[PDB]
Write a protein that binds this ligand. Structure first.
Ligand code: HEM
Ligand code: HEM
Ligand SMILES: CNCCN(C)c1cccc(CCc2cc(C)cc(N)n2)c1
Ligand SMILES: CNCCN(C)c1cccc(CCc2cc(C)cc(N)n2)c1
Ligand SMILES: CNCCN(C)c1cccc(CCc2cc(C)cc(N)n2)c1
Ligand SMILES: C[C@H](O)[C@H](O)[C@H]1CNc2nc(N)[nH]c(=O)c2N1
Ligand SMILES: C[C@H](O)[C@H](O)[C@H]1CNc2nc(N)[nH]c(=O)c2N1
Ligand SMILES: [Zn+2]
Lengths: 403, 404
């Protein structure tokens, strides 16, 4: 059986046949669906994943079954047979990284998947050198506000040794300072990493938007501390198009969303340090980062400034304040000439991506709970679109924290 | 550690384990290879086991498992089955089963109320005219002049050989949907087919945006008959806004009573093909889905124009702004009219309380995240941050094929 997928707004129906190429089990079983869960609970194997990936690569360049194709499988086989592992050509790696983004079910930004600048950093042997590559990435990706998607790929994992790792979950994070009286100053999501930085010698600040340093780790060594040159970290001060007092709140966010703690798996090789960046969708900053109860939690403050009735839920003060905060983010980013996409625009393009992918591959892995935005869900077309979630390789995956 | 699904709340950081799912006797649409959780719609020896299971559920609920009465009722049920092929529920078993079906419904956010359900037994009903009297009674009792009371009316069970009782309409209250020559729809496009069915069966149609449909009621092996609800039994709330004076001029309205009439109620293998149930609305159902879905009333652009918003670009957030005010109008207008309603914040907070109750009482709660999280302001509600486990328990409300 192939899943019958329906759009309830338009009445149209597709069949996902791509899921048959899934070689990895998810968390669901016939007895119960575990879809809303955020986190998960041999030479022949490697060789098999290598052959299958090499076959995808040569299929992608219309040279499948050719001579260069067969010699490449020969190479891979020979290298694994002798050393237990192998290595990718740079052009293969580039193909692999784009394909991993393309396959990421939780990503609403995949219309962009073919446009990705890939920096090969596999020739890196120290934390200092990682830092050099990281600064290059940030400088390129940021491009004075004209953001460009990029990934930098550090050396693959090896059986013999510890991993290359970036300890920070993103290249840019605001410190979270735990007070003696339980509360948090700054970003509460970053309390643990803030404390790790301090322990490793960083002189902390006392602000709510203190850009953290990076903890970079070369294999089997203590991580090293590197401060990002403040001119490389582009930030956008937040104001509101019609609410003059909003700017007073001193709110701000950084331009570059660059995830640095996921593992990139291509053809069985694993890249434990491979930071990637694109550009923000406004709800990430406006709704989640600023309004989550366990993040900056600014909803009530903004509601009070707007003079809303905050004593009852039925006045929708939360809904009203959230919309103004999101609007302030879009306004501010557009004012600063920094790329951002609103959730209506983002989801319309994802619908186009679904149709592209339906034609190119016969389906598209999508995580509904993650694709539908955190405000105004049914106001976007993805809400009305059934989706099929499953795991394809190449893939980005979670990995354990290196401490 | 524990060999059951681990469930995390990401706002609070707390963990539970769902052991209730072990009790699931029916498989959903998911497999290890792919998740189909976002899809809306993916006997003799059999009957006995389902029956035995339900009777065990019943005797546990009254804390008498293993007792003399428990084993006698088991013998009583398998006796009746062996000699007829089916069996009858005691009254109190029906009341238990109906409640348990609601308690078990994964897509329902209102389940904190589950123990408070008035069950009207109508298993004696023997005509379509009689079904109508029962339905009127339900509506009268449940509406209660605006102070809504949850209720279900249970009509006769499927009987081997004999045809089903069916209410053709999807709800007891439904606005007509009149397809136009230009291909558009006047009224509710959700109800185009049932509207045409009513006409085909001799209803004289109106031409408004809010014409209350007649009921098509079908007794065993008979053609359905048409029944017009007396307008004084159908409570409606005109929609106005607390500060935007022009909103009332839009002439929008909604009915007080959400009463679902097309689901099958399954208890212990017995099937009640007509068993309409009603509660009260969550405001987002009306304010967001029914009024702003593009394939429903689709008034978002109308309202945004009245609010003088820039509808030419997505990034003005005109949709979001307009949706918020429409939802506000629904709440304000129901409150003014003294008609029970619950906003999505109060509703989701109470659902979180329900999850905690069920965690202690049953070791879990089957829940469908995509349906539990509201259609506006998702992450502003606590359920967005709550992982959920979805599975099918019985007694249950189930979808059944349309009778035509
Ligand atoms: C170009 C603009 C992009 C936009 C607007 C975008 C948007 C998003 C959003 C909103 C999420 C949900 C994140 C959250 O709520 O925490 C997400 C997830 C994700 N993104 Fe994209 N993204 C973009 C580019 C990229 C790129 C360039 C990559 C990698 C090459 C990527 C890989 C991923 C992955 C793997 C996830 C899922 C993470 C997980 O499973 O936890 N994205 N994206
Ligand atoms: C008392 C207040 C109640 C509230 C606020 C409430 C709320 C809701 C909401 C918002 C939905 C989502 C439906 C949709 O989006 O179309 C729903 C679904 C559902 N409700 Fe409740 N409900 C209530 C009472 C009841 C009662 C009394 C019953 C039965 C005795 C019931 C059974 C169900 C079932 C079976 C579903 C899911 C049906 C499906 O799968 O489509 N509800 N409810
Ligand atoms: C732990 N779960 C989520 C945190 N991680 C690892 C994660 C992964 C992917 C995306 C995000 C949100 C940040 C982000 C990244 C990119 C590339 C684009 C974008 N708009 N946002 C965060
Ligand atoms: C509300 N009506 C059902 C009450 N119950 C459970 C009930 C009523 C009368 C008799 C019985 C005994 C079971 C039984 C056996 C046989 C041969 C026929 C029958 N109708 N019921 C059970
Ligand atoms: C696709 N699923 C729709 C099935 N139907 C008709 C259905 C079932 C249950 C609930 C609803 C929404 C209407 C409703 C009913 C009740 C009892 C309470 C409430 N707040 N809303 C609709
Ligand atoms: C429990 C639930 O799955 C969790 O809160 C998810 C819901 N959907 C999400 N969607 C996005 N884009 N990002 C998130 O962090 C989450 N969180
Ligand atoms: C495709 C998707 O599952 C579908 O649009 C669902 C999403 N969640 C929902 N949630 C509720 N409460 N009601 C609905 O009708 C839907 N529709
Ligand atoms: Zn699933």
């Amino acid at each position: 059986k192939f899943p019958r997928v329906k759009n309830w707004e338009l009445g149209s129906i597709t069949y996902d046949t791509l899921c048959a190429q899934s070689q990895q089990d998810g968390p669901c079983t016939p007895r119960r669906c575990l879809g809303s869960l955020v986190l998960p609970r041999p030479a022949e194997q490697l060789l098999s994943q290598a052959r299958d990936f090499i076959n995808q690569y040569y299929s992608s360049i219309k040279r499948s079954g050719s001579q260069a194709h067969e010699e490449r499988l020969q190479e891979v086989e020979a290298e694994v047979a002798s050393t237990g592992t192998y290595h990718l050509r740079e052009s293969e790696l580039v193909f692999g990284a784009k394909q991993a983004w393309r396959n990421a079910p939780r990503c609403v930004g995949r219309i962009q998947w073919g446009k990705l600048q890939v920096f090969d950093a596999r020739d890196c042997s120290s934390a200092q050198e990682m830092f050099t590559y990281i600064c290059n990435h940030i400088k390129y990706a940021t491009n004075r506000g004209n953001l460009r998607s990029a990934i930098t790929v550090f050396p693959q994992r090896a059986p013999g040794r510890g991993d290359f790792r970036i300890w920070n979950s993103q290249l840019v994070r605001y410190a979270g300072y735990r007070q003696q009286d339980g509360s948090v100053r700054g970003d509460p999501a970053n309390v643990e990493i803030t404390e790790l930085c301090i322990q490793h010698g960083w002189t902390p600040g006392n602000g709510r938007f203190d850009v953290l340093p990076l903890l970079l780790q070369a294999p089997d060594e203590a991580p090293e501390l590197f401060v990002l040159p403040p001119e490389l970290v582009l930030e956008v001060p937040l104001e509101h198009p019609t609410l003059e007092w909003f700017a007073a709140l001193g709110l701000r966010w950084y331009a570059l969303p660059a995830v640095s703690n996921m593992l990139l798996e291509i053809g069985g090789l694993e890249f434990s340090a491979a930071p990637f960046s694109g550009w923000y969708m406004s709800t990430e900053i406006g709704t989640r980062n600023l309004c989550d109860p366990h993040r900056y939690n600014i909803l009530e403050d903004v509601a009070v400034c707007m003079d809303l009735d905050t004593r009852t839920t039925s006045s929708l003060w939360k809904d009203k304040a959230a919309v103004e905060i999101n609007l302030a983010v879009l306004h501010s980013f557009q004012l600063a000439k920094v790329t951002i996409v609103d959730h209506h625009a983002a989801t319309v393009s994802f619908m186009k991506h679904l149709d592209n992918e339906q034609k190119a591959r016969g389906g598209c892995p999508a995580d509904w709970a993650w694709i539908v935005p955190p405000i105004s869900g049914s106001l976007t077309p993805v809400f009305h679109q059934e989706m099929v979630n499953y795991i394809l390789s190449p893939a980005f995956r979670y990995q354990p924290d290196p401490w």
